[PDB]
Structures are given as structure tokens and as C-alpha cells.
mmCIF file of C-alpha atoms in Angstrom:
data_model
loop_
_atom_site.group_PDB
_atom_site.id
_atom_site.type_symbol
_atom_site.label_atom_id
_atom_site.label_comp_id
_atom_site.label_asym_id
_atom_site.label_seq_id
_atom_site.Cartn_x
_atom_site.Cartn_y
_atom_site.Cartn_z
ATOM 1 C CA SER R 58 0.000 0.000 0.000
ATOM 2 C CA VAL R 59 2.928 2.351 0.629
ATOM 3 C CA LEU R 60 3.705 1.760 -3.056
ATOM 4 C CA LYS R 61 0.613 3.254 -4.703
ATOM 5 C CA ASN R 62 1.542 2.432 -8.309
ATOM 6 C CA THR R 63 4.031 -0.379 -7.741
ATOM 7 C CA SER R 64 2.125 -2.498 -10.295
ATOM 8 C CA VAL R 65 4.550 -5.231 -9.209
ATOM 9 C CA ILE R 66 3.672 -5.719 -5.530
ATOM 10 C CA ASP R 67 0.973 -8.049 -6.828
ATOM 11 C CA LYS R 68 3.590 -9.767 -9.006
ATOM 12 C CA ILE R 69 6.212 -9.753 -6.243
ATOM 13 C CA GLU R 70 3.782 -11.298 -3.748
ATOM 14 C CA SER R 71 2.742 -13.769 -6.450
ATOM 15 C CA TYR R 72 6.331 -14.896 -6.919
ATOM 16 C CA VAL R 73 6.809 -14.973 -3.136
ATOM 17 C CA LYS R 74 3.799 -17.204 -2.494
ATOM 18 C CA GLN R 75 4.594 -19.371 -5.519
ATOM 19 C CA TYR R 76 8.166 -19.648 -4.212
ATOM 20 C CA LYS R 77 7.002 -21.077 -0.883
ATOM 21 C CA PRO R 78 9.115 -24.230 -1.515
ATOM 22 C CA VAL R 79 12.256 -22.967 -3.252
ATOM 23 C CA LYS R 80 13.522 -26.526 -2.787
ATOM 24 C CA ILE R 81 13.334 -29.459 -0.410
ATOM 25 C CA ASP R 82 15.415 -30.717 2.468
ATOM 26 C CA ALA R 83 17.958 -33.479 1.828
ATOM 27 C CA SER R 84 17.626 -36.288 4.380
ATOM 28 C CA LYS R 85 19.299 -38.720 1.989
ATOM 29 C CA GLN R 86 21.021 -40.401 4.957
ATOM 30 C CA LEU R 87 18.984 -43.611 4.986
ATOM 31 C CA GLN R 88 21.545 -46.360 4.300
ATOM 32 C CA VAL R 89 24.772 -44.443 4.909
ATOM 33 C CA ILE R 90 23.433 -43.748 8.389
ATOM 34 C CA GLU R 91 22.659 -47.451 8.843
ATOM 35 C CA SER R 92 26.102 -48.569 7.666
ATOM 36 C CA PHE R 93 27.906 -45.979 9.790
ATOM 37 C CA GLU R 94 25.803 -47.046 12.772
ATOM 38 C CA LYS R 95 26.570 -50.717 12.134
ATOM 39 C CA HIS R 96 30.327 -50.176 11.833
ATOM 40 C CA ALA R 97 30.471 -47.861 14.847
ATOM 41 C CA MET R 98 28.283 -50.072 17.036
ATOM 42 C CA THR R 99 30.124 -53.297 16.224
ATOM 43 C CA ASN R 100 33.500 -51.649 16.828
ATOM 44 C CA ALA R 101 32.378 -50.036 20.090
ATOM 45 C CA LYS R 102 30.800 -53.268 21.336
ATOM 46 C CA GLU R 103 34.045 -55.115 20.597
ATOM 47 C CA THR R 104 35.938 -52.401 22.477
ATOM 48 C CA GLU R 105 33.596 -52.531 25.489
ATOM 49 C CA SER R 106 33.666 -56.335 25.689
ATOM 50 C CA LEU R 107 37.456 -56.275 25.428
ATOM 51 C CA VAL R 108 37.620 -53.675 28.206
ATOM 52 C CA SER R 109 35.349 -55.727 30.472
ATOM 53 C CA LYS R 110 37.426 -58.848 29.800
ATOM 54 C CA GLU R 111 40.608 -56.914 30.597
ATOM 55 C CA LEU R 112 39.014 -55.736 33.851
ATOM 56 C CA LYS R 113 38.138 -59.320 34.781
ATOM 57 C CA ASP R 114 41.611 -60.606 33.870
ATOM 58 C CA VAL H 1 34.991 -35.063 7.222
ATOM 59 C CA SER H 2 31.828 -36.277 8.942
ATOM 60 C CA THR H 3 30.864 -38.502 11.860
ATOM 61 C CA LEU H 4 32.978 -41.523 12.785
ATOM 62 C CA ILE H 5 33.850 -43.548 15.897
ATOM 63 C CA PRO H 6 37.210 -42.268 17.241
ATOM 64 C CA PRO H 7 36.872 -44.270 20.457
ATOM 65 C CA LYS H 8 35.506 -47.515 18.968
ATOM 66 C CA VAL H 9 38.853 -48.166 17.256
ATOM 67 C CA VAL H 10 39.975 -49.995 20.407
ATOM 68 C CA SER H 11 38.920 -53.064 18.412
ATOM 69 C CA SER H 12 41.931 -52.920 16.076
ATOM 70 C CA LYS H 13 44.404 -52.643 18.965
ATOM 71 C CA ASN H 14 44.122 -52.971 22.721
ATOM 72 C CA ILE H 15 45.677 -50.192 24.767
ATOM 73 C CA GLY H 16 49.272 -50.788 25.795
ATOM 74 C CA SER H 17 51.024 -53.390 23.631
ATOM 75 C CA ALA H 18 53.998 -53.304 26.002
ATOM 76 C CA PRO H 19 51.641 -53.243 29.030
ATOM 77 C CA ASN H 20 49.747 -56.112 27.377
ATOM 78 C CA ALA H 21 52.954 -58.159 27.082
ATOM 79 C CA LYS H 22 53.839 -57.324 30.686
ATOM 80 C CA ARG H 23 50.347 -58.310 31.851
ATOM 81 C CA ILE H 24 50.467 -61.549 29.843
ATOM 82 C CA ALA H 25 53.742 -62.415 31.550
ATOM 83 C CA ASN H 26 52.030 -61.432 34.818
ATOM 84 C CA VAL H 27 49.084 -63.790 34.225
ATOM 85 C CA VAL H 28 51.326 -66.798 33.575
ATOM 86 C CA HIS H 29 53.587 -65.803 36.478
ATOM 87 C CA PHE H 30 50.885 -65.234 39.109
ATOM 88 C CA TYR H 31 48.568 -68.066 38.030
ATOM 89 C CA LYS H 32 51.314 -70.714 37.829
ATOM 90 C CA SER H 33 52.381 -69.824 41.367
ATOM 91 C CA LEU H 34 51.980 -71.825 44.556
ATOM 92 C CA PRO H 35 48.982 -70.952 46.778
ATOM 93 C CA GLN H 36 51.099 -70.376 49.888
ATOM 94 C CA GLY H 37 54.609 -71.805 49.613
ATOM 95 C CA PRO H 38 53.219 -75.096 48.335
ATOM 96 C CA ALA H 39 55.347 -78.173 47.524
ATOM 97 C CA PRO H 40 58.002 -78.086 50.310
ATOM 98 C CA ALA H 41 59.254 -81.716 50.556
ATOM 99 C CA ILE H 42 61.926 -81.347 53.253
ATOM 100 C CA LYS H 43 62.114 -84.608 55.209
ATOM 101 C CA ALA H 44 64.211 -87.548 53.988
ATOM 102 C CA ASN H 45 65.893 -90.512 55.670
ATOM 103 C CA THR H 46 67.453 -93.573 54.008
ATOM 104 C CA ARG H 47 70.874 -94.712 55.266
ATOM 105 C CA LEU H 48 72.664 -91.500 54.250
ATOM 106 C CA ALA H 49 69.567 -89.339 53.707
ATOM 107 C CA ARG H 50 68.848 -89.443 57.452
ATOM 108 C CA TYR H 51 72.055 -87.407 57.653
ATOM 109 C CA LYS H 52 71.472 -85.324 54.513
ATOM 110 C CA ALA H 53 68.060 -83.935 55.451
ATOM 111 C CA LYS H 54 69.234 -83.478 59.068
ATOM 112 C CA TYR H 55 72.888 -82.369 58.906
ATOM 113 C CA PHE H 56 72.890 -80.620 55.506
ATOM 114 C CA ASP H 57 69.612 -78.858 56.343
ATOM 115 C CA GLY H 58 69.695 -75.099 56.716
ATOM 116 C CA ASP H 59 67.904 -74.881 60.062
ATOM 117 C CA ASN H 60 71.332 -74.483 61.691
ATOM 118 C CA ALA H 61 74.001 -74.361 58.931
ATOM 119 C CA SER H 62 76.484 -73.698 61.738
ATOM 120 C CA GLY H 63 80.047 -74.976 61.963
ATOM 121 C CA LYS H 64 79.280 -78.376 63.486
ATOM 122 C CA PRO H 65 77.407 -79.550 60.333
ATOM 123 C CA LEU H 66 80.729 -79.703 58.485
ATOM 124 C CA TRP H 67 82.641 -80.761 61.614
ATOM 125 C CA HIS H 68 80.670 -84.016 61.806
ATOM 126 C CA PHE H 69 82.572 -85.067 58.677
ATOM 127 C CA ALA H 70 85.881 -84.226 60.387
ATOM 128 C CA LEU H 71 84.986 -86.210 63.513
ATOM 129 C CA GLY H 72 83.913 -89.209 61.434
ATOM 130 C CA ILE H 73 86.969 -89.140 59.195
ATOM 131 C CA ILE H 74 89.106 -88.918 62.344
ATOM 132 C CA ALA H 75 87.351 -92.015 63.690
ATOM 133 C CA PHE H 76 88.125 -93.780 60.398
ATOM 134 C CA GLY H 77 91.734 -92.587 60.262
ATOM 135 C CA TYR H 78 92.569 -93.575 63.827
ATOM 136 C CA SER H 79 91.589 -97.150 62.994
ATOM 137 C CA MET H 80 93.478 -96.706 59.718
ATOM 138 C CA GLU H 81 96.653 -95.856 61.638
ATOM 139 C CA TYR H 82 95.983 -98.696 64.085
ATOM 140 C CA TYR H 83 95.711 -101.217 61.245
ATOM 141 C CA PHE H 84 98.590 -99.530 59.377
ATOM 142 C CA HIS H 85 101.247 -98.300 61.836
#
């Protein structure tokens, strides 16, 4: 309204609303996460079991 | 770069390779050790052993333990001179 003859505030708001999703998120971590978790968990479990066995020994 | 498991690498090597070797020597040393001074086996007596476990035993280890040999050899040698001289 402060721009009385903008003649583009309609167009600018149109582009703004139509650009509500410029793009999407990228949560592509769905098997890389699983593999990293598997490797880390197996290694850490081996470490913890080894530590407990060392404590017992 | 990204996430990893810096601590979980204790799998590839246990801490202290030299301490591990020392502890492995320690396990064999302490385990294969007598409970409390076990396996003494001190007493013995058979003709001469009745003298060995008694006179060569370290309970006294004084001067008379050797001097018994001198007294005995003197007993033998006096008869040796008697039969000889």
C-alpha cells in the first residue's frame, strides 16, 4: 500500500507465495546412516567387551 | 569429514602393547604360582639321607654340620693308623 503504483507488488507477492518451496530438504542419509551405525556399534561393542574382559583378567 | 567412531577403534588394537605383554607375563607368572609356599618336601631318611636332610639342612648351617665329617673321618683314620702303623 505504501507503493501506490508499484504495479509489481501483486507480481512480487505472487512470486513470493509461488516460491514457498524454493527446494526441499535433503535427508538422503537412509543407508549411509545405517552402515555408519553398524560399523560404529560393532567396533564399540568389541571395544567394550574387550575392556570388560581386561578388567576381569 | 563427517561422523565416525574415534573411540571404537579400540577393536583394532588394545591399549598398551607393552603393558599387554607385561600383563600376559604377569598372568602366567601369578597363576602358575603356589597358593602359599606349596610343595616343600623337606624330610628324607634312608641310610645317608637321614644325615642329609638333618645335617645338611639349613635350620642351623652352623660350623658343626661340616665338623661331623671331620669327627667321622678322624674315627676312620685312627683305625686306619691302628691297622697300618
